Design an enzyme around this catalytic site. Structure first.
Site, short mmCIF file in Angstrom:
data_model
loop_
_atom_site.label_atom_id
_atom_site.label_comp_id
_atom_site.label_asym_id
_atom_site.label_seq_id
_atom_site.Cartn_x
_atom_site.Cartn_y
_atom_site.Cartn_z
N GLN C 231 0.84 -1.45 -0.01
CA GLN C 231 0.04 -0.12 -0.17
C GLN C 231 0.74 1.19 -0.12
O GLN C 231 0.44 2.42 -0.01
CB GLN C 231 -0.97 0.03 1.07
CG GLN C 231 -1.85 -1.06 1.03
CD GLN C 231 -3.08 -1.18 2.43
OE1 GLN C 231 -3.28 -2.05 3.21
NE2 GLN C 231 -3.59 0.08 2.61
N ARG C 378 -9.07 -0.08 8.20
CA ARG C 378 -9.80 1.16 7.91
C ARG C 378 -10.01 1.90 9.11
O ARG C 378 -10.93 2.39 9.55
CB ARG C 378 -11.29 0.69 7.23
CG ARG C 378 -11.20 0.15 6.02
CD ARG C 378 -12.54 0.37 5.12
NE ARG C 378 -13.05 -0.65 4.32
CZ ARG C 378 -14.00 -0.57 3.33
NH1 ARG C 378 -14.41 0.75 3.12
NH2 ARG C 378 -14.27 -1.58 2.55
N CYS C 379 -8.97 1.96 10.07
CA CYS C 379 -8.84 2.50 11.15
C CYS C 379 -8.34 4.06 11.18
O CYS C 379 -8.43 4.62 12.24
CB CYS C 379 -8.14 1.76 12.24
SG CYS C 379 -6.46 1.09 11.66
N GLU C 751 -12.97 5.07 5.12
CA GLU C 751 -12.75 4.69 6.40
C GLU C 751 -13.73 4.86 7.54
O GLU C 751 -13.90 4.22 8.43
CB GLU C 751 -11.32 4.72 6.87
CG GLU C 751 -10.37 4.12 5.85
CD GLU C 751 -8.83 4.03 6.63
OE1 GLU C 751 -8.82 4.77 7.54
OE2 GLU C 751 -8.03 3.39 6.04
#
Ligand SMILES: Nc1ccn([C@@H]2O[C@H](COP(=O)(O)OP(=O)(O)O)[C@@H](O)C2O)c(=O)n1
Ligand SMILES: Nc1ccn([C@@H]2O[C@H](COP(=O)(O)OP(=O)(O)O)[C@@H](O)C2O)c(=O)n1
Ligand code: FES
Ligand code: FES
Ligand code: FES
Ligand code: FES
Lengths: 797, 156, 797, 155
Positions: C231, C378-379, C751
């Site tokens: 990523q 997705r934090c 997110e």
């Protein structure tokens, strides 16, 4: 530590070894024919056995039924896409596949696609074609006669073309430069006048690797990717996009490693267009790689100028005027690579290295049943013909006045103090110093001693050999750029460079040019090394991929060093400016307070306080100073203000065997001045290759056609290429006269050895016959042809 | 009908089935992806396809793969040993004996064999011993220097 | 017509179909495991069967003799290259291959290299390893006890780490934010107070495609090429270069198509290093692709926070202060993805959507015998924890005051006029309008009617089911950027975009980010489409190739739209400014006399006189107006001035079966406001997916460890992943409150659904038990756990 | 090794395979049909779903050797002469994919499910697609994609 640091960079002026070698010496180079893709099919072309005739019918059934053959296409399959014809750089149109008739022998008539090149070759033989022969046209003069057959029936009814009015159906154009009325006036009353007709024979660049491509249209992603032997991939991308309707961003053209270009791989050949079309139709990769016979026969040839040179002067040798008239044989279609405003290239540079007050040249191009071309083979856009014309004429002038060939040149040279010099033709020579260079060469070879020796042999009526001395003092014009003046199909002839410095200090660089073996991956790196204090070893340069490299006009005519070489320095300097601004912030001082010393910015009067390019690079990604974007990179598109004008003094001594006509080069001295030298080792190689091409052109190469139009000697069985045994040992020298307008004062050089060496050989051969009145002998100077001259002048054995 | 053959290329056995008309050059390039050897002509003049077969220099474009069943073929991809360049590869690199690199693989394979036929060659002998290889870029000058370099390294 | 031209662009605001779908729906995507290179070998890893213990001996002979096996490497082979340990984004060090001991079950102990994955698997079974089991540390609390075993024997004697002083050998760090003195004071004098303990269970992102790579070092060219599921390929390249000694320009990292990231593919896993080392050693390509059990067991996990939340208030519900203390379990090594200065991420965003005058938080990091991670689902860097905490606390305070949960929120919201609002923690919220969004949600679901149905059901003691209503009103903080405070391993958290317009009007664009299915190839094109009047369809975007794309920090924490989105607009706007300048030259007017209307510059007053972007593009390549360089392209690195703060208001209604503990989501309404919306269709997809992850985490996901430290339920056999049947129908709504500082007012949004949904589910489950005094229930709310609570509070059956 | 002949996407494939070779590896490694994916080792995800002898089967839990004489269809074979199949069009139009990892399996399942049940209800779709997991879509759009394909198949 400063002398060592600079040396460790291996930048400007260093004879560092090539970065390219590693892959090439282990067979890991990547050329078009090395490419294999999933589902790749092979294409071969059915070619014309005759030179001129109508196509009655083409039989595809037998070929189509053959197992492994996927399709057989003709001009009929190309019409719906408006591709049976294509635009050329010359502004004319060329047949992709012969439609109603064939214009030259070996022309592309039909194509076949098969599982491999073996089945493909078979499929070509299985395709039968019927033709109705038409009267052939092989001589330019015979081509313009009233009763001459119509070749280009497609442009019947057009009174004008891309380069002005057309007076005959086989007449392509008439172009001229210089003051005509003024020139005629000098010649009308001048005391000394010389005239010479000369033919610069049609030759072929013949690169070891022939042309080819691997076209690939992906129907899923909807985009085309084609690997190709192209010297201008970006230009091809733009052109392919428009002809196909596929949006340019979805077209990717990539020139991988190329086995030499020499100008031969600048144009788009029907083979490429066909593979692309075939790929789009079959939804898969199609490979096309031509054989040697096909390359020599159908791709861009060079020269083929029938010239009439004239010189006007006062009895002391001082030239007063130059008048030239040329008939150019361009073949069936005019696909001659050149800027759109110059149908005869830069031929008006034929004023040469001399201050000639009045001149005028005139070129007339004509159609014939032969393959397209004209500009290829290290010529810089007809500069080869220009140099050959002027130097041969000066020799003619010198012989009529019985004046020494070196003396008459020293008398007409543009003086060093006259630069920047504007010629009778409008060119502005950037810089030069011909006298110093000439004296150097003459002393080096003991010119007077050679003359004394030549005098001795001539005295003995029984000397078994003739001695000839040839001398050429030429001026090249390289770096096709000035956008107001030069453009390729509308694109200004600028070039570009993009450099990106990484967080750790190394860098990646891409330019709009494309090397074919001249060492760009090494030299380009050297330019950047000196500008940024980053060793050349870690500056990875890349070219040829239209989806990654900045837009450029490609490599040919020795334009890389002049144009791209400039873009590289300027882009590097944009980075250097930002590096200073960043170094100042880190050192907490003002900018003009910093000194650049090889690879760091140091505080004036305090060596202990400095920041290297590595420190700066990290800082650029870590915390950009206020008002600055993060990163450290730049791009630069350079539109050159003027061309580059390198020069050279070439001398050759030949000994001709009176019994056989065999000519042996005893010595060849080449002095080239291309301004600031990037890598002398690389420069030397380019010289060796260029002089060897010259020996090839002058001593053996030619492309003869018989009465029926068949191309004779189109394979290596007859097409001359010297081996290590025929190639003489070259002696090289140089002087350094930098181009004032260039960011690093560097001038091109690759094409100089080719342009200059050719007339030097003729000058040496002709000088051997000078004592019996010979003014000129047409190329090639083979044993056979030279013997015919010995026979005619009663010098045989 | 395809013929099953096993060719030893660079010390490795290559088991394939090819039509008898398959030229060795295409077998090496197409069947084995040993694309170092090149094609520069159709008349056997250039030598860009030169590989070493059973101890002799041979133009693979004028030899059948089907004639190599059990033969010992050497290609440019096999000159280096454990990554260390053969004296001949080092010679062409150090002396700038290559530009476009198209004739290089052939020149190297030829130089490799020539140097065994003649360990201490004079310039004339080098130029003559390398006559089967054409080069469009170098002018041959640096090539003879490269061979002289390789010659010296092999004797030390 | 002008409206038609804008529609034709398919730019900002349009719900255009995706450009990347073509290849995926036909199986032509290019993921890591799809790659095959010449001579590519396959690697497999020998993993620890125990959670903690010393390595006595590793047996390699049986595996080495196995036909097909080329190598078996251990930590011993890594020591010379100093690679048996590697640095982490958290400033700690993680073992690449266990050396003296293993720190967690499934840890990498050795590797094998074989012809394929089949033989490779056999080789792992043949490699035998002897261990000496040591006492295991599972609970963070037991880890801090005086007699707790020494996990990190490599850190022995150290009193400080990378995030401050260390008070115990298992203690990683202690971080705090806010005004402790002021907050402690508020709580001491507060009339109303609540404190609740809650565990945010350790869960795993579990992307469908696991981690993997194909590392390829070419000994001939001397460079490395690694295709990887990353990523952040650019920083990977920088790190790989540093650890290998290979210059950065000779290292190329490429993230191809990635089957989902969700923060799981941000870090560098030992598998990558080993593949690289193996490739470098063997001189050929090495492929490594982990299985599902390896992914869940060893790649980055999320959450695992033990929180003690406190809220001070007045009788009417106005929040006076916030106090939070946390114990964080980071596993054996701290490799928690985070900006260098924030070991607990942006947890101090826990003030939420409320104007809380005083607050303080303190996070204590702890080592345990578990796999590393913490931030990866997705934090947005611990925002998931911060939101869960504040929302849970507000509910607790609401129930204590017998005040409606929506009313207490509306009363504490930061009002629209307060933005830009600076919180007690120091964040400057860009913009918001919580009140309007809340009323919008409450109205759409008829909230009052819902409470009445709930009241009516509670009134009947025989009601077979329990009704629960959960409401969450949250504020996100995405776009990790300000280089002054945010940096990854020293690299400022900026991002970039390079756009290049071609001669014919189309374009190519590259960014420093890397999509994993979120649609950048469509959305990014839409941004540029509107900025330049070029249809999005022909603006080809690419990411992930470090050798072609501009340097960036990749994508995670919904930073793409905030950071890259700004760089894209700014780079586009640089091009638009030059285009205006060019249009002025063409139209022979001054720039100020021009008007941009969708896709052309037109002269004010006279509409017939104009120049399209196509016209301008061509002119840029034809002949640049004096003063300008040829070409039309720009680059921009954006260092964001602040984060982006999108908000949301989610409501969920659940019905719990009193006889089985089963929870059925009857309804879920999600309203998100991410400012300017690029593509509503793509936004809707992100919401659906994130809410689904929320449902999975709150209702089923967990990673339990037994007393011996063995990971339980680490395969799809037990690890919860909802199917189409368990996943409820999501109702979505939105409002638009643009980010003032953002070039296009767009905020991240991917997110938000994840972060907000989790506490919405717990809010609904707890609210169902609220009437009997329940304040909180820890996740997961599986039927087993809910039934356990049902029996405890006498509500079973 | 057993010599087998499998018809894949309409073409015969005579190959020599080891009995332990999973159909999914045979499809991906031998034929390079890399559309089908692997998401687990427990047979839950269904990203490896292909159509075998008229039925939807998870190729990671089937041996290639068992396909001797079988008719196998993969996502690479859905399109007809370049024209997308109803299901492929449905997922595109209804934004039924993001990372695209589960897509090939979803398409192959939907392709068969729609022949099993031409007019399914939402509940029937969700249940009929239970063997396929997705991490990005939340399934909602996938349902609409299947409904879209169903409407075009009866058109
Ligand atoms: N002043 C100069 C000119 C050319 N060169 C080099 O010689 C080679 C041919 O340069 P060039 O500009 O004349 O020709 P192309 O590279 O356009 O074929 C390029 O690698 C060079 O950089 C040099 O080192 N110094
Ligand atoms: N205001 C917004 C924000 C995101 N998006 C889109 O949603 C997707 C996820 O955007 P994002 O910035 O929140 O997350 P990443 O793409 O950093 O995961 C990207 O394609 C988008 O451009 C949008 O259309 N409008
Ligand atoms: S290809 Fe020319 S001799 Fe072999
Ligand atoms: S280097 Fe080009 S032919 Fe030899
Ligand atoms: S790979 Fe998961 S069911 Fe086949
Ligand atoms: S689209 Fe990514 S798992 Fe389905």
């Amino acid at each position: 530590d400063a002398e060592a640091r600079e040396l460790a960079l291996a930048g400007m002026g260093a004879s560092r070894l090539r970065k390219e070698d590693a892959r090439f010496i282990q067979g890991k180079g990547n050329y078009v024919d090395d490419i294999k893709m999933p589902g790749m099919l092979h294409m071969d072309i059915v070619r014309a056995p005759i030179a001129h005739g109508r196509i009655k019918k083409i039989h595809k059934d037998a070929a189509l039924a053959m197992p492994g053959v996927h399709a057989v296409l003709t001009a009929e399959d190309l019409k719906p896409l408006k591709l049976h014809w294509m635009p050329t750089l010359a502004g004319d149109v060329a047949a992709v596949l012969a439609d109603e008739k064939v214009h030259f022998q070996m022309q592309e008539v039909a194509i076949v696609i098969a599982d491999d090149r073996y089945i493909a070759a078979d499929a070509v033989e299985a395709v039968k074609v019927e033709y109705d022969e038409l009267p052939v046209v092989i001589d330019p003069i015979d081509a313009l006669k009233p009763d001459a057959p119509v070749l280009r029936e497609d442009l019947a009814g057009k009174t004008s073309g891309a380069h002005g009015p057309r007076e005959h159906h086989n007449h392509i154009f008439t172009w001229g430069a210089g003051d005509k009325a003024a020139t005629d006036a000098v010649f009308a009353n001048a005391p000394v006048t010389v005239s010479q007709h000369m033919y610069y024979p049609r030759v072929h660049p013949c690169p070891l690797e022939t042309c080819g491509c691997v076209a690939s249209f992906d129907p899923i992603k909807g985009d085309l990717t084609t690997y190709i032997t192209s010297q201008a991939p970006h230009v091809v991308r733009t052109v392919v996009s428009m002809l196909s309707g596929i949006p340019e961003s979805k077209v990717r053209i990539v020139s991988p490693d190329i086995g030499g270009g020499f100008g031969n791989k600048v144009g788009i050949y029907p083979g490429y267009v066909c593979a692309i079309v075939a790929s789009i139709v079959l939804g898969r990769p199609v490979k096309w790689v031509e054989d040697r016979v096909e390359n020599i026969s159908t791709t861009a040839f060079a020269r083929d100028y029938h010239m009439d040179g004239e010189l006007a002067a006062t009895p002391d040798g001082k030239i007063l005027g130059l008048r030239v008239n040329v008939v150019a044989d361009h073949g069936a279609f005019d696909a001659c690579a050149d800027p759109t405003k110059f149908p005869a290239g830069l031929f008006h540079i034929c004023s040469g290295s001399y201050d000639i007050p009045r001149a005028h040249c005139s070129v007339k191009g004509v159609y014939t049943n032969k393959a397209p071309g004209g500009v290829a083979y290290r010529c810089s856009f007809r500069v080869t013909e220009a140099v050959y014309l002027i130097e041969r004429m000066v020799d003619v002038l010198a012989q009529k006045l019985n004046m020494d060939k070196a003396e008459i040149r020293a008398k007409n040279f543009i003086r060093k103090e006259q630069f920047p010099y504007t010629t009778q033709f409008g060119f502005e020579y950037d810089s030069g110093d011909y006298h110093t260079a000439l004296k150097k060469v003459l002393d080096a070879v003991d010119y007077p001693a050679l003359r004394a020796e030549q005098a001795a042999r001539r005295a003995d009526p029984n000397s078994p050999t003739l001695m000839g001395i040839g001398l050429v003092t030429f001026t090249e014009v390289v770096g096709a750029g000035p956008s107001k003046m030069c453009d390729i199909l509308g694109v200004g002839m600028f070039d570009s460079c993009e450099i990106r410095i990484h967080p750790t200090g190394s860098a990646i660089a891409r330019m709009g040019t494309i090397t074919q073996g001249q060492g760009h991956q090494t030299t380009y790196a050297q330019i950047i090394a000196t500008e940024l204090g980053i060793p050349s070893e870690v500056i990875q340069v890349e070219e040829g991929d239209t989806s990654t490299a900045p837009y450029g006009l490609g490599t040919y005519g020795s334009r890389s060093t002049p144009v791209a070489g400039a873009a590289i320095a300027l882009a590097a300097r944009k980075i250097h400016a930002k590096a200073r601004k960043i170094a100042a912030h880190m050192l907490e001082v003002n900018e003009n307070d910093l000194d650049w010393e090889v690879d760091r910015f140091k505080v004036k009067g305090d060596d202990s306080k400095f920041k290297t390019m590595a420190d700066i690079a990290w800082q650029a990604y870590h915390q950009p100073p206020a008002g600055l974007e993060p990163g450290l990179e730049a791009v630069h598109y350079y539109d050159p203000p003027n061309f580059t004008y390198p020069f050279g003094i070439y001398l050759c001594v030949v000994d001709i065997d009176r019994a056989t006509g065999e000519t042996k080069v005893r010595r060849f001295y080449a002095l080239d001045d291309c301004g600031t030298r990037i890598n002398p080792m690389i420069i030397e190689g380019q010289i060796h290759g260029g002089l060897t091409e010259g020996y090839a052109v002058a001593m053996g190469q030619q492309m003869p056609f018989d009465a029926q139009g068949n191309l004779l000697g189109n394979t290596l069985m007859d097409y001359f290429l010297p081996t290590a045994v025929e190639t003489p040992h070259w002696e090289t020298d140089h002087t350094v006269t930098p181009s004032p307008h260039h960011p690093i004062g560097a001038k091109g050089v690759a094409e100089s050895p080719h342009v200059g060496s050719i007339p030097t050989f003729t000058a040496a051969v002709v000088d051997a016959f000078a004592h019996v009145g010979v003014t000129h002998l047409d190329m090639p100077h083979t044993s056979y042809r030279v013997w015919k001259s010995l026979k005619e002048h009663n010098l045989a054995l | 009908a395809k013929k099953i053959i096993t060719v030893n290329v660079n010390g490795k056995a290559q088991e394939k089935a090819v039509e008898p008309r398959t030229l060795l050059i295409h077998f090496l390039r197409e069947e084995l992806n040993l694309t170092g050897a090149h094609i520069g002509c159709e008349t056997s003049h250039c030598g860009a396809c030169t590989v070493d077969i059973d101890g002799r220099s041979v133009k693979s474009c004028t030899h059948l793969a089907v004639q190599c069943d059990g033969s010992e073929v050497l290609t440019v991809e096999g000159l280096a040993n454990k990554g260390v360049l053969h004296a001949v590869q080092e010679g062409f690199y150090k002396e700038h004996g290559l530009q476009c690199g198209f004739c290089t693989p052939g020149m190297l394979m030829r130089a490799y064999r020539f140097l065994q036929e003649n360990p201490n060659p004079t310039e004339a002998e080098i130029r003559m011993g390398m006559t089967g290889n054409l080069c469009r870029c170098t002018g041959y000058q640096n090539i003879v220097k490269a061979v002289q370099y390789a010659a010296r390294k092999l004797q030390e």
